[PDB]
Amino acid sequence: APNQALLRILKETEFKKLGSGGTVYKGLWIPEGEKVKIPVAIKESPKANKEILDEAYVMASVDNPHVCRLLGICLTSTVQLITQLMPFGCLLDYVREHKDNIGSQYLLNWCVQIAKGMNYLEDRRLVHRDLAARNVLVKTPQHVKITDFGLAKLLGEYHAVPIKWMALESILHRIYTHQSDVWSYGVTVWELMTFGSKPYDGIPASEISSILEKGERLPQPPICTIDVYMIMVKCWMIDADSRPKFRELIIEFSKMARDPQRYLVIQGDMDDVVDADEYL
């Protein structure tokens, strides 16, 4: 099927410019005419351009409440990616910073929303290849979205990286599927339930392939009942088709979000501004 997505090109004079390592910035996008101010994030060598344009290609082709939307690109010195600003940051830093305030309702609901976004990416025949808690931003504490499609690939499995989030098949053979994304989903859920701990903390990345082959996995988080930990372990099966599907992960965590304290045991449980989701 033809990809009739629209690539929107933005005037640099329509911005009023967060993180470097390229550089991501924050700003306002004021389209000429319409009295409207959109809070945006602006991400500022031939290779780079091919890669930002590949990432821009992917984001322009997805449209889902739990996937980061692309607003457009600006064609200057280096190409800029303009996306919706997510004010609360990435989810990895957020659960670390608010460790003493994350309730089981928020944890289980984020798991539902991430699986919804990943399930949508599967519908678009898209393999994310880099699902992690650092790549999930927070619009509001009640609403998260998946991001960072720099590694994403469109399927017609994929034959080609963060070692501690990828499946054993991805490490041994470089094969990626939606089912290898389920593995990364499992590590991401583990990251949330441990309030931001680092997976396999201390183990260099080179022995990870040996550890997982001999049968070892990530430990059971303290707040996690066996019901939640079982779902994680299922995401880490050797046999990729034995792992759960994102549509099933939605159903399972949905049921748990209706009785959160049964599955997570936690102690003590600017005027014309328009968010990008309302500027269609």
Ligand SMILES: *CCC(=O)Nc1cc(Nc2nccc(-c3c4n(c5ccccc35)CCCC4)n2)c(OC)cc1N(C)CCN(C)C
């Ligand atoms: C987890 C780090 C981070 O995201 N911090 C952050 C982010 C935003 N808002 C926002 N909105 C859309 C996209 C992004 C973003 C950033 N980075 C990437 C990389 C790949 C894809 C998207 C993307 C790299 C790191 C910077 C942002 N970010 C935000 O809104 C005010 C505030 C923050 N924080 C918490 C500041 C970062 N802090 C660690 C100094």
